[PDB]
Amino acid sequence: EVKLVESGGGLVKPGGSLKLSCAASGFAFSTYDMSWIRQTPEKRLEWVATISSGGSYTYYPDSVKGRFTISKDNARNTLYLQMSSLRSGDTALYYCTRFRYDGWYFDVWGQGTTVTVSSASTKGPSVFPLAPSSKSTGTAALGCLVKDYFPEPVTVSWNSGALTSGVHTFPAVLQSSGLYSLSSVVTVPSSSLGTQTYICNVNHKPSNTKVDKRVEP
């Protein structure tokens, strides 16, 4: 089955550099042209680079030309975007994509990796529980408050991915301090409360922060 899996994103200083990687599987990689597309914070989609199957031609838009290099490793079926002299405007989610030749369409997409170009240092979040009570009550709601981090993203799962129904992980909010915070909540049967275990699994890769908070009444 056809897949693209991206890695390498993270926080970098203005005028720094960073290389993205995109591991392909399931198809004859070196027989397709491949691209990178970025999605800005306003959700605009922009084409950033394309490389022919031969590796012979490379195509970039004017905003990126001279700074970004798309390349590929054919033994390992991996796609790369070397990004250098990064600017503030380069911050975005970056996707790799397979550009089918007959139709010229993008038919498989990566999951995305996010790049944040900023002068500020990373800061790892604090993780605080949102305990179920008679005040969050036959369903009770509990949660996790992931406070004061930079940059995005933070991911949250519950019971290591075992719990998903009634899970709401909210978009990050900006604090006045310029740091983000987010909530992740879940509703459950209140009868389960005494008996079943509820933990949030929180990762912030840029600060190598990995926390599990058991949330109890």
């Binding site: 989609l45 084409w47 993008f106 009570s133 709401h168 909210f170 987010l182």
Partner: protein, 215 residues
């Protein structure tokens, strides 16, 4: 080649038809005959996924509910018998002339019946206090429409400038939204007061619901 979409957002009821339009700056015929115009849908939390290419060609797997048409400058996608799983952002896209470009997107929104939120409050955690700050969380769960008003009160004094709010994208199982609002205070300010209230105004409540707790 600017691609411009309308409407920017499109409420539609289940079973109904949705129509989205895409206009290009210049013509998007590639001097090969074909015109490389394409429609993508990006569902919440997912990558964009290909629906239509070369104007009217369904990409494999794409239900027969989706169709494309249009000529040279003007393109339409139509979605008949809209299902809840169809909500998200639809994008048009042009690889006829270089650089390839995308329109700015149209949000498909599922119209359903009003639903008042389930409102819960969470006091600060002892853990957070020990560190110097106090966050009070207010959750409005699974409501419709997206508009909700949340007022924070500390000993009945309306609060301003000291809270943040976000709302989830529309949910596919039941077409509702959820909202979290956080009131952030000093340990000190938190300690001086008694009554922490979150009061919610919404289209599905005849009058406001206040959930409170006493420190």
């Amino acid at each position: 080649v600017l691609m411009t979409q309308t409407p920017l957002s499109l409420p539609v009821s289940l079973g109904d038809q949705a129509s989205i339009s895409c206009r290009s700056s210049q013509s998007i015929v590639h001097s090969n005959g074909n015109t490389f115009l394409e429609w993508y849908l990006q569902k919440p939390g997912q990558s964009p996924k290909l629906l239509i290419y070369k104007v009217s060609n369904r990409f494999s797997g794409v239900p027969d509910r989706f169709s494309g048409s249009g000529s040279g400058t003007d393109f339409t996608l139509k979605i008949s018998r809209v299902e809840a799983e169809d909500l998200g952002v639809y994008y048009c896209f042009q690889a006829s002339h270089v650089p390839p470009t995308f329109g700015s997107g149209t949000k498909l929104e599922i119209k359903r019946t009003v639903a008042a939120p389930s409102v819960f409050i969470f006091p600060p955690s002892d853990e957070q206090l020990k560190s110097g700050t106090a966050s009070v969380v207010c959750l409005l769960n699974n409501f419709y429409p997206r508009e909700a008003k949340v007022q924070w009160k500390v000993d009945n004094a309306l609060q301003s400038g000291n809270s943040q709010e976000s709302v989830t994208e529309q949910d596919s199982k039941d077409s509702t939204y959820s909202l979290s609002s956080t009131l952030t205070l000093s340990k000190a300010d938190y300690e001086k007061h008694k009554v922490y209230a979150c009061e919610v105004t919404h289209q599905g409540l005849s009058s406001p619901v206040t959930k409170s707790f006493n420190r």
